[PDB]
Ligand binder design. Structure first.
Ligand SMILES: [Cl-]
Ligand SMILES: [Cl-]
Length: 162
């Protein structure tokens, strides 16, 4: 298992514009298009993203290309974030994947704010981190996905995804 596979399971794959868990227009494998309430605005952001008039539909290859960029951007924002990088550098391969998942989902800023959980992860206090991560709007809005990531940090295995 790896990051791609992991996120592919958490986000799914949709080839037409859809609303995410927050009601925002999205496409592909969790590619957010816009927070605006307008489908037209979504369609425009979509064509700009793919470089063609899509009519709000893309192909699988196109979804995968957006995914590749998105995963890459997430890793890179982790590496540039002064709060995130030290954490990521301290972790093993499997837990690094869980930090990337959260960043993909919530954005770097959102993640950099789990101050307390970051500190526990960095100190390798697994159970403490897991408990703290659960006290979040994140866990209350998307509990099954959050439990999966949390278990990942707790155990350092892919068990939650098999
Ligand atoms: Cl260490
Ligand atoms: Cl809470």
């Amino acid at each position: 298992m790896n990051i791609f596979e992991m996120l592919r399971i958490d986000e799914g794959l949709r080839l037409k514009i859809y609303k995410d868990t927050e009601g925002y227009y999205t496409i592909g494998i969790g590619h957010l298009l816009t927070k605006s309430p307008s489908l037209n605005a979504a369609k425009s952001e979509l064509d700009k993203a793919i470089g063609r008039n899509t009519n709000g539909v893309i192909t699988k290859d196109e979804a995968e290309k957006l995914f590749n960029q998105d995963v890459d951007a997430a890793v890179r924002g982790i590496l540039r974030n002064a709060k995130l990088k030290p954490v990521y550098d301290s972790l093993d391969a499997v837990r690094r994947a869980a930090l990337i998942n959260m960043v993909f989902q919530m954005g770097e800023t959102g993640v950099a704010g789990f101050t307390n959980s970051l500190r526990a992860l960095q100190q390798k206090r697994w159970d403490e981190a897991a408990v703290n991560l659960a006290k979040s709007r994140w866990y209350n809005q998307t509990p099954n996905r959050a439990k999966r990531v949390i278990t990942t940090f707790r155990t350092g295995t892919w068990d939650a995804y098999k």
